[PDB]
Design a protein around this ligand. Sequence first.
Ligand code: GSH
Ligand code: GSH
Lengths: 217, 217
Amino acid sequence: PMILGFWNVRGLTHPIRLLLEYTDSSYEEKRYAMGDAPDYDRSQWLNEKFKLGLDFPNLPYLIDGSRKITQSNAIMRYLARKHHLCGETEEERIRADIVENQVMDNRMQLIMLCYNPDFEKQKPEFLKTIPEKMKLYSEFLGKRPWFAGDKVTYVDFLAYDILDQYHIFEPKCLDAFPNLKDFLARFEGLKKISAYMKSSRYLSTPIFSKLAQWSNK
Amino acid sequence: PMILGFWNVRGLTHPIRLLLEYTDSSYEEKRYAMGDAPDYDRSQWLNEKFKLGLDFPNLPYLIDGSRKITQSNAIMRYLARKHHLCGETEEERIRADIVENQVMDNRMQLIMLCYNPDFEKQKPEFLKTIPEKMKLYSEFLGKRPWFAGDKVTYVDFLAYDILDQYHIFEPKCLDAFPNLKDFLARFEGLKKISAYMKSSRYLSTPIFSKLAQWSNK
Ligand SMILES: N[C@@H](CCC(=O)N[C@@H](CS)C(=O)NCC(=O)O)C(=O)O
Ligand SMILES: N[C@@H](CCC(=O)N[C@@H](CS)C(=O)NCC(=O)O)C(=O)O
């Protein structure tokens, strides 16, 4: 089976665990544990960071035979390439490309907040940026069932995760935006996703490493 | 023509400018100026940000007729599909995806270090690191002319940029890596690239605004 490796958290891998499922892929996972404060020992990982034959060692990684892939979007795209969950017209590919990048910006802005010792006094400003972020996703999807058109793509898996995360962080943030709730619900409503969500393998929280100020435990 | 918008800095747009040149695109640019200290003004940009009909307003942007793109990465992939500068086998596509993503990570690490608090009382420490990032590119490439193998692909413009910056901030950083040195020289050597670096359009520095630390004048 393929081997996915990642920390014992959701992090940036939720989209990959979900695609592995959706596709009825044969895989096993390696979930590395980190230590508690004040030092956050990472040896579990570091004892093999340099021994997997990875080009640019990092977490997450995928191994399917000989092929060894790092960078979450590159894992994401290899799988989609495999399963045909990519754009099929220029129009689909543009929409996919943008959304893939936009998620990461928004995923990054979140981390930057959750990883700062100033969280508490910083939160109140970040919170005012939210409506605006949500509004873009809302206007972008419009009346489309999925982010790139009338077909599910690997970008819906990326979008679902970031929209979910922001939702956990501010429960009310999708209230003014019904096509997004409609979005979230339709994603879940999927056969293998529903099934996965009630399995022993489902990992929704913590979001972040014990190092974060939020969703760290 | 096509319009490229961005700040009047290098930022993360170097590869786009270079690709537009190489492809003999018909384009003009709008090089937004940032006011300065204290309040470094962005009025030039903010006044039309939500007026151009961009889904996800940001710098940089590409308008090519009816197509309006945002996200530096999506701009590249778009230009790469338009002119047939994509990998042609699974193996090439995989090498492209990873490289594409790796650059942004290296690209962001560098900025993290330049706009921050005690850029100096942390100076060395992340410098002593270049050398070991370099080895990774080095080994990844090996003896291939180009990063996805046989042919020049869009990722090459992105590899070029990052290796070019690391080089500014570490004049020797490459001493150990012939193949990297050979790469730079043979990039700087493509016919339209040559010509462009001699032109009035060319902008090698500053890399990031007044504000910053490094490449900020
Ligand atoms: N660009 C990367 C970021 C990867 C990354 O930062 N991985 C983290 C946690 S999310 C890590 O700790 N990597 C292991 C390491 O640095 O040794 C991605 O999209 O995969
Ligand atoms: N991931 C985005 C980065 C974009 C971004 O951070 N843009 C900065 C300059 S490097 C900006 O000033 N953007 C315009 C804005 O935020 O309104 C990209 O790859 O295009």
